[PDB]
Design an enzyme around this catalytic site. Sequence first.
Site, PDB file in Angstrom:
ATOM      1  N   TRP B 121       1.043  -1.183  -0.223  1.00 40.47           N
ATOM      2  CA  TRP B 121      -0.137   0.137  -0.290  1.00 40.47           C
ATOM      3  C   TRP B 121       0.962   1.475  -0.211  1.00 40.47           C
ATOM      4  O   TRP B 121       1.643   1.875   0.803  1.00 40.47           O
ATOM      5  CB  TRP B 121      -0.772  -0.318   1.061  1.00 40.47           C
ATOM      6  CG  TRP B 121      -1.621   0.840   1.536  1.00 40.47           C
ATOM      7  CD1 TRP B 121      -3.103   1.748   0.486  1.00 40.47           C
ATOM      8  CD2 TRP B 121      -1.841   2.097   2.680  1.00 40.47           C
ATOM      9  NE1 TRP B 121      -3.409   2.149   0.917  1.00 40.47           N
ATOM     10  CE2 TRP B 121      -3.161   2.761   2.176  1.00 40.47           C
ATOM     11  CE3 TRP B 121      -0.929   2.160   3.651  1.00 40.47           C
ATOM     12  CZ2 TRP B 121      -3.308   3.921   2.768  1.00 40.47           C
ATOM     13  CZ3 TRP B 121      -1.328   3.094   4.139  1.00 40.47           C
ATOM     14  CH2 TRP B 121      -2.727   3.510   4.173  1.00 40.47           C
ATOM     15  N   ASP B 203       0.228  -4.363  10.028  1.00 36.95           N
ATOM     16  CA  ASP B 203      -1.186  -3.426   9.896  1.00 36.95           C
ATOM     17  C   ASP B 203      -2.501  -4.153   9.623  1.00 36.95           C
ATOM     18  O   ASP B 203      -2.575  -4.521   8.924  1.00 36.95           O
ATOM     19  CB  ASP B 203      -0.634  -2.485   8.099  1.00 36.95           C
ATOM     20  CG  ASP B 203      -2.045  -1.596   7.945  1.00 36.95           C
ATOM     21  OD1 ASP B 203      -2.705  -1.998   7.641  1.00 36.95           O
ATOM     22  OD2 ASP B 203      -1.842  -0.940   6.751  1.00 36.95           O
ATOM     23  N   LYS B 239     -13.182  -0.476   6.811  1.00 35.55           N
ATOM     24  CA  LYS B 239     -13.253  -1.389   5.917  1.00 35.55           C
ATOM     25  C   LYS B 239     -14.394  -2.750   6.653  1.00 35.55           C
ATOM     26  O   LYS B 239     -15.444  -3.323   5.876  1.00 35.55           O
ATOM     27  CB  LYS B 239     -12.463  -2.717   4.577  1.00 35.55           C
ATOM     28  CG  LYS B 239     -11.498  -0.993   3.709  1.00 35.55           C
ATOM     29  CD  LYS B 239     -10.515  -0.990   4.428  1.00 35.55           C
ATOM     30  CE  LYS B 239      -9.403  -0.345   2.966  1.00 35.55           C
ATOM     31  NZ  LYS B 239      -8.105  -0.244   3.204  1.00 35.55           N
TER      32      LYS B 239
END
Lengths: 414, 392
Positions: B121, B203, B239
């Site tokens: 990312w 993460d 999310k």
Amino acid sequence: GMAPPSVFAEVPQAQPVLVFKLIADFREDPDPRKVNLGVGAYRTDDCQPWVLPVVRKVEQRIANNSSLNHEYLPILGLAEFRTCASRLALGDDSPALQEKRVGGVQSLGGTGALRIGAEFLARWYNGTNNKDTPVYVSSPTWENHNGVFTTAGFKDIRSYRYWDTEKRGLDLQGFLSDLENAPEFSIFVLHACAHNPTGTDPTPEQWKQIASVMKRRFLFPFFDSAYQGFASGNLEKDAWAIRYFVSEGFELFCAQSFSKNFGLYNERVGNLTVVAKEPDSILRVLSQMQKIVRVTWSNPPAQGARIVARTLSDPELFHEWTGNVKTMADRILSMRSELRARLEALKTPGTWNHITDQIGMFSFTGLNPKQVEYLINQKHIYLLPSGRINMCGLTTKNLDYVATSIHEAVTKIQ
Amino acid sequence: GMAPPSVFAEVPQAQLGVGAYRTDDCQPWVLPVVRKVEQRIANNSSLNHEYLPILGLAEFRTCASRLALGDDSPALQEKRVGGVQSLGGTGALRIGAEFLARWYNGTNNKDTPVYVSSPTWENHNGVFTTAGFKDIRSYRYWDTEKRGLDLQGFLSDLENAPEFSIFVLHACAHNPTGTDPTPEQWKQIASVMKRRFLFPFFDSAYQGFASGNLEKDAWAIRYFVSEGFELFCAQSFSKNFGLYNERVGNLTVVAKEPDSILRVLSQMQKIVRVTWSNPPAQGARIVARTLSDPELFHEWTGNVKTMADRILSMRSELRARLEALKTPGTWNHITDQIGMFSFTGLNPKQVEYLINQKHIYLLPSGRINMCGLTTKNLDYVATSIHEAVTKI
């Protein structure tokens, strides 16, 4: 054989924060006469938080609108919020708005607006990556100005004279001298109105003198606007200085908070307004702002900005909001007037016109640290060692006791 | 001879593709449990708007860390866990990076290598660079030829990393590849990191969302905890709660003992104070209410599995179809991969056939969001991969 030490074994315990202990001591106190003048937010005459009626109304409309989704806002934030916020600060008729030379970055409260602006200046202002431009803050100032600008990388934070202890007001000559001696291009962090923590603001004529030096020495105004409307009840008067600088041709930043004037403290609603000389630079400045935001919070939250945008963009809600703001401002004006009247009725030594000349919820009372210690330890009235009080801690019920206790402190201590 | 030059005169202009869940109708989906909790909040007039603590809403931080670590985590029972509410996963990464750049591996050590996956990312690099780290490195991860994990390269990069280097690890649903280590592979990764004192900075942006099961998706984090690691875990609720625009995150800290948590959190507070002061309430209130009510929690896990199952369906159908037309190459990666994002394995202008001629829009890397596939674009998307692979 022994387990290795933690990778955190040498991390120091941070310094204790004073006001947190003060509030904790206040809540420990069993005395029924106790008063918290150390609170940092609006409180009603019954000592309660106040959710503004217009905010409750808009929250209900939001909750009843199932078409709203939770998809990411743009990096720079909700467009209608940014436009309405900047228009509130600058005025509908601002020349800078007409000329399309204004940008707005939604931020995490006024704090986040200050931080993004500071990060931008430390990268692109007065050279590329110039961490040495002096940043000037008032003496004294809001407790986190220094930390925000230091964390953004500025190595030279300075103070300008501001509070004068003997006159209980503005040291204009000291401020003007510090402006005159500031290196060209230095950044000045200016409280737009309702100076925190003193409550002492320049008058319009004094602002003109300040602006004149800044214009001549190319000093950059970074306004901090946390109390527009809240301060006096009059949104135009509270923005007069910002708007005067705009009409004098300054480029500037203005970090706006909606924490106090909407009571939206915990929804973290702010806006960084940018005023530039030419329209074409707004796109470039905002493109760099986007990069800064992206690596800090990515994009901002929706709920509080939605409330503010809905309120500011609807005439009926806007009018209700201005009435709610006036309610807060008028309560503070009343507590100031009532406290001063009582101190004078008690023939308290010294002058007390600063109690009503000051603006907003915070007041430097002029009490010294030993007198503050007396109020806390003997009278159970909690305030900061600086003598700062929040006028919202005064109530119809406690005013006599607070005034009497201050009179005792002034006459008996030192 | 203008007038004073602008202080902004020299500021430069800075230089299947969705990234969020979409239904079969191509619309956003507010989770049913979120709508229910939002109504409960709206009906509770006792809630005020006063500032939250600097570190955030206590019930949210506790619930979030329990979600990551497991309710029975020994680290939780031993009181050696801290949680900092943050502005999404991004904010959690940033606060953690700021802390490490000040207090880890020395004082103000900006030279500690920070390793991110190849690819990752992209905001990983920007966050750690902005925190001041001068030496951002990559570890091998995606193998283009095998369309899977280059475990040997990753292990070699771990072995060659200076002791105390920081590794940014995707907890599950690796973004952008969709390829995760299996548990056996995670054990090999952890073994090198333990031996070389490498710091795990997880993460965790897709817990539960990733596979449909929140417990399975947290296994790697919990395994590192059980192996005695101290670690950070940047959690996002964007999310898995669909709360993208309420900016709900939590930085979980695991230390060797409780006193270190106290000192770490005291420094965290200073970092937060000068960044956003204190965090917003609405999204954290929604998450805390959901996770602290077993009825709501169960409803939420069903909502999460609904999303994961639609993605798993799209993965199942896309691969079966590409094999129904038996396109050249292997496509088990389409279903071996986990999460919303898939490295399809197509070359930087095997896409622009899909772009220029059939207008299927995807990244130059070949990353697609599976939530962009539907029962009604099934048809055509993959009869476009079939010809994109056969023609150019």
